[PDB]
């Protein structure tokens, strides 16, 4: 039985978001890619550097915003600028959110030597697609 990136059925009491409710074979059929960049095109180079940078942001954003992150990030790379779109719960006061936004934008920009955009959308709770 396949087990890749799946949530198992357990009665009807466990909420599941849209991303987690679809099996990996549904990619490019019902759900898109969480990251989009040129590296994985046909005749384009520089695909390994993008991948390692992508993984680091998955680990940095998850740790910078403990508990208040809703689901996976969305990373868009246009020109040389990097846009990070996130869903954040209503946990921290707005003062701390702007502190972390300012902290993240400056630290990443001076680390990857590229401008960084950080756009946040706030939701009251995790969005439930099935079960519950």
């Amino acid at each position: 039985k396949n087990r890749a990136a799946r949530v198992r059925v357990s009665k009807g009491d466990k909420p599941v978001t849209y991303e987690e409710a679809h099996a990996p074979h549904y990619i490019a059929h019902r759900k898109g890619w969480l990251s989009l960049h040129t590296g994985n095109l046909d005749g384009e180079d520089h695909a390994a550097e993008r991948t390692v940078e992508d993984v680091f942001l998955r680990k940095f954003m998850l740790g910078t915003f403990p508990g208040c992150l809703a689901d996976q990030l969305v990373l868009k790379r246009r020109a040389n600028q990097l846009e990070i779109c996130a869903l954040v719960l209503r946990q921290l006061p707005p003062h701390k959110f702007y502190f972390l936004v300012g902290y993240s934008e400056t630290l990443l920009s001076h680390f990857y030597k590229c401008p960084v955009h950080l756009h946040l959308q706030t939701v009251p709770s995790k969005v439930v697609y099935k079960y519950i």
């Binding site: 990996p24 990619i27 490019a28 898109g32 390692v52 992508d54 998955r58």
Partner: protein, 101 residues
């Protein structure tokens, strides 16, 4: 810390190769040409073999940058086969989808 001692050894090996890359190329040019006298080529073989062992391009090993799996690594993404599926099945790699035809 790299993920394993083996990965650390590879970094030293790659670093040493880069330092002696040009010097090896100049000496190796003499050996690979048949117009120079045979006496000079024999001396070149002694010098090229006197260089440190780690400064050899063939000794470089391609591993995974995440888990350092010595084999089963795609050269394009520099990732192990297990890690590549882990990233691709979650949709975290652009343009990568399950093949159906």
């Amino acid at each position: 810390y790299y993920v394993d001692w083996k990965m650390l050894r590879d970094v030293k090996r790659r670093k040493m190769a880069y330092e002696y890359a040009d010097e090896r190329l100049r000496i190796n040019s003499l050996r690979k040409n048949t117009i120079l006298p045979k006496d000079l080529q024999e001396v070149a073989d002694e010098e090229i073999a006197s260089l440190p062992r780690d400064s050899c391009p063939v000794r470089i090993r391609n591993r995974c940058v995440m888990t350092s799996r010595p084999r089963g690594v795609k050269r394009r993404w520099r990732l192990s086969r297990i890690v590549f599926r882990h990233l691709a099945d979650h949709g975290q790699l652009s343009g990568v989808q399950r093949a159906m035809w």
